[PDB]
Amino acid sequence: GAMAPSYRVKRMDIAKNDEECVVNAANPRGLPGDGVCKAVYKKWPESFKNSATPVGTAKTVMCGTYPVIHAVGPNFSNYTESEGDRELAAAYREVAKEVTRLGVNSVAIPLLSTGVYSGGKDRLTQSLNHLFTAMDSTDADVVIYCRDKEWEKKISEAIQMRT
Ligand SMILES: C[C@H]1CCCCN1C(=O)c1cnccn1
Ligand SMILES: [Cl-]
Ligand SMILES: [Cl-]
């Protein structure tokens, strides 16, 4: 565990993270995909051997000894708001199980279903709150990666609000 488990946010490419493992915003087919998933594929392509897993699940594949937790958020283009909300919360619960099982002291994590799976809606608060619901009972340091300057501020505010 971390001595004083924290949440932090950084605005940069999660492929450059300084944590003991990474969460991929994966597709269910284990394809290279786009956005975070493509960055992860370029940095850790070995981790896509048999990474395919259903929506709402996480499957970890090692790249060397570096764990890549492939977490499949729902595509809100395809799901109802109700069903997509349930699967998004479920994917984060599976991430917390994997982080715990791996025994890491830190994890780099993107906000699932906030990019091309968002159905064109702003889901920062929805996705971040499901992240907190899942990760709050873990003792790993969590570092959230984003790319948008306004999202960095909003994520940082939500972290600081609870301290
Ligand atoms: C998926 C995007 C684009 C479509 C509208 C919804 N949307 C955002 O609000 C957003 C997400 N992530 C970072 C910055 N903005
Ligand atoms: Cl960067
Ligand atoms: Cl996404």
From Swiss-Prot:
Phosphorylated by host on serines and threonines. It is found in: Host cytoplasmic vesicle membrane. Residues 4-163 form the Macro domain. It is a peripheral membrane protein. ADP-D-ribose binds at D13, N27, G35, G115, V116, Y117. Changing Y117 to V/W: Almost complete loss of mono-ADP-ribosylhydrolase activity. It comes from the Viruses. Interacts with mRNA-capping enzyme nsP1. Interacts (via C-terminus) with host G3BP1; this interaction inhibits the formation of host stress granules on viral mRNAs and the nsp3-G3BP1 complexes bind viral RNAs and probably orchestrate the assembly of viral replication complexes. Interacts (via C-terminus) with host G3BP2; this interaction inhibits the formation of host stress granules on viral mRNAs and the nsp3-G3BP2 complexes bind viral RNAs and probably orchestrate the assembly of viral replication complexes. Interacts (via C-terminus) with host NAP1L1. Seems to be essential for minus-strand RNAs and subgenomic 26S mRNAs synthesis. Displays mono-ADP-ribosylhydrolase activity. ADP-ribosylation is a post-translational modification that controls various processes of the host cell and the virus probably needs to revert it for optimal viral replication. Binds proteins of G3BP family and sequesters them into the viral RNA replication complexes thereby inhibiting the formation of host stress granules on viral mRNAs. In the N-terminus, the macro domain displays a mono-ADP-ribosylhydrolase activity. The central part called, the alphavirus unique domain (AUD) has a zinc-binding function. The C-terminus region, also called hypervariable domain (HVD), is mainly disordered and binds several host proteins. This intrinsically disordered domain contains 2 SH3 domain-binding sites and 2 FGDF motifs necessary and sufficient for the formation of nsP3/G3BP complexes. This is Non-structural protein 3.
